[PDB]
Design a protein around this ligand. Sequence first.
Ligand SMILES: Cc1noc(-c2ccnc(-c3ccnc4[nH]ccc34)c2)n1
Length: 167
Amino acid sequence: VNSFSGYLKLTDNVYIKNADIVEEAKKVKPTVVVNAANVYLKHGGGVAGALNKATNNAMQVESDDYIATNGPLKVGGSCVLSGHNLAKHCLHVVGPNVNKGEDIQLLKSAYENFNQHEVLLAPLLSAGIFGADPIHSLRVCVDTVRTNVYLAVFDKNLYDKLVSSFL
Ligand SMILES: Cc1noc(-c2ccnc(-c3ccnc4[nH]ccc34)c2)n1
């Protein structure tokens, strides 16, 4: 039993809710919140900009030190950093950005990072400003992630389309 509330169950291990991931993180304090990161951990907009804003820029400060030490992530890769006031940990995962021409097949590799964590609160990778089809992203999530994932979808209209079209 966990504290996630109001989710629709899609499969054995995948759950979905129309929610603001920032507000959901603030209420649940999950062990892991996933950020929709880029390779530079520059949290300017989308989910990343919202999560970072909610940490009063502490996420960005920590991220800049991470990059200065380690260099950029790989597309499809991830790193574990602090969850600050939102979660114990933040798993920064880099899905391909279609608006940069990155290979959508890397989306499966990106979701594989979730399997290193038993339970996660997450957005749909490569959705939103990353330019992928969120319905495709949901399909790859369900077919790749085996651990327990709670998907927060900000847009109510999109949430309804994802549920209604789910196979
Ligand atoms: C601009 C832009 N382009 O894409 C997106 C996107 C993609 C996936 N999930 C989200 C999302 C999901 C749940 N809560 C959220 N709070 C703030 C963002 C967010 C946003 N934003």
